[PDB]
Amino acid sequence: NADNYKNVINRTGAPQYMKDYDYDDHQRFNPFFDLGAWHGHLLPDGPNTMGGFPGVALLTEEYINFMASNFDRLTVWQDGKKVDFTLEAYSIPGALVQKLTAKDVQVEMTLRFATPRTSLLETKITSNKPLDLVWDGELLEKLEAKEGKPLSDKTIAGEYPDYQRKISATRDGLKVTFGKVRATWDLLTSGESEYQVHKSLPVQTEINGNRFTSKAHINGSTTLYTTYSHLLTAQEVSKEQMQIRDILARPAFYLTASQQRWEEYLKKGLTNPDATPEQTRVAVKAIETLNGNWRSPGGAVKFNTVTPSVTGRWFSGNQTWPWNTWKQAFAMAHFNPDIAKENIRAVFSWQIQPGDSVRPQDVGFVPDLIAWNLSPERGGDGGNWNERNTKPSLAAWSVMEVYNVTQDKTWVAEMYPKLVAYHDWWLRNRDHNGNGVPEYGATRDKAHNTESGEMLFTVKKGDKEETQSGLNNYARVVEKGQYDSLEIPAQVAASWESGRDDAAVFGFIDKEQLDKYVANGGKRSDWTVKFAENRSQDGTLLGYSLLQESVDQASYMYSDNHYLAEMATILGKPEEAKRYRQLAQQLADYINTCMFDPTTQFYYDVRIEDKPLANGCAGKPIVERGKGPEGWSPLFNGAATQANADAVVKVMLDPKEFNTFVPLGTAALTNPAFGADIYWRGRVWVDQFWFGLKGMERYGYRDDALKLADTFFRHAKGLTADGPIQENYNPLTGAQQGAPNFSWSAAHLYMLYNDFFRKQ
């Protein structure tokens, strides 16, 4: 029951700036969103906010921007005298609650969500005499701050002259109008968006520039109702009036709907009886977090989706990525299965079709990033929407977990063809050596190449830049190697497509570390990831590949074939299933044979060397760039043989390798590029962690995973505090880092609850 879980996350705070950013540019507060709505609310922290839920957070299509600190804050007056209240404020799963206590008057305010654009406040007043009610509010003025401190003296209206915010009174409340602003990286409004306030009683309203006062009289105890609605289009504004009228006409129905929606989340969700109360509350933090990141249809995205973080700088709006989607939907299938199915649908709703007007050669491609606004290339003015690359595909796994939970045959029939086209695209456009095993890469694009299809790249040295074109020139410039750095947009995009930005296995390594690598007898060339282009037989360019085959990528492909075979068998396709089992078999054979080094007893990526080996392997395992989580991807995805897996677990459990203060980080201590505070070269991510625990388990090492889970739990910082879920942990110290309310950490924290956490 909800009440058992008060203040799981700290949702207090009084924003002072539109961008009230923390150190990494994320909104430093944690607003309550639900039902996919495009606004959210914080709790009051003291006297100045008491009587209201401060911090109206607006989701301006692709970003989170605060509107007001105080907005619709109640204050109570009896015989011209202000009533003095003391405050209790708390969140629960699915609602914010605050109570104001005094001698002769008491107020109970409960804020829940009614529709995907409209939240509902219930104000329950209890009094033995008549009362005068004052609500007040004030829009924000100041622009930007970091850690509470201002970065400038810039004002919101200065920065956006065409915003022209205007508070206006109405027949049953007030409203805020917003002018058109197309600040592509900051603030995005249609020109007809609004924040509407509607009340269940007549009120009298005074507007004073960018603040308001509103008054009313009541005879005694009474429960009144208020709607708050952020609406982004003229068409939304019209289509809501009707739904506001039905909420005020029957509030209890909507409270009850929400109230019940959440009891069912918690019921379906909290299914591990071995878990401790502390661990069960971590699971609920994740469910809240995950549900908060759920957005309803909005702009170009016709489905309900889930973003990496609603308070994130670049993860807000309905901006959706396939990678974290699979992880999110795997977890949310175990509690909010409806929206898990929609998240998957949303990612596949812009899958490339035959005859596409941008990339007809990318059929099956699933974009890296979809959002409210399409790219100029597709008709919109969006700067985030991205088809430079996809991301690593665990689609079939994620789709199969929803079916595991629901048993819905029609779900599998819906998805199968979407997945098969994605599978086919990998093999056609990401297998430079037609050898059956994928590379990470990039697509053909404005940013990657000329209109002739000649790959762009910039050569840098000292203060000198030199943009050039063509794979011929690129090859040469690399051979000579007379540059400080070499920027290839297409190669930059394949690091995105890898899922890891700074990774050792893709050649990234700081001066001082590389120097010690050389002093230990390495050559600098060992860290140079070559790059090539994929052409059809017709000579058409299809994209690019890293001249390197990644072991995680091959493992995910094994999974893809594995699950597509089961899906095929379920849909009564025995011959398509036999073919996927065979592809799977060839991938396991290639992974074990080509990517496992018996010497160091672990898996690694392979180079696509200029000529293949005697055993069909495109190259030798890239052991010289150290070990990392990809090493146990074959265990997780089930590609590994019992023996090879036995070896990998030996390494994983070794204190000098991956078994650290927080285990299973993103580079072993023995990696040459290792850095404890480096995101993808040391720091522990919960997904990788969990892939690893599952991997041990699958090959008989459940009790060892349970140990590591207990270590993770005792050591990972803040896990049982009330702070938002973040991205990763330093493996030596436990410090958290990365964006608050990070979905996939929630996805996988939740699954750690479901699989491995227990009473010790």
Ligand SMILES: OC[C@H]1O[C@H](OC[C@H]2O[C@H](O)[C@H](O)[C@@H](O)[C@@H]2O)[C@H](O)[C@@H](O)[C@H]1O
């Ligand atoms: O938009 C493509 C990109 O989106 C996500 O990364 C957002 C990044 O945007 C800027 O590069 C910013 O400076 C970074 O700090 C921020 O993480 C995603 O994580 C990438 O994989 C890629 O899809």
Ligand SMILES: [Ca+2]
């Ligand atoms: Ca290949």
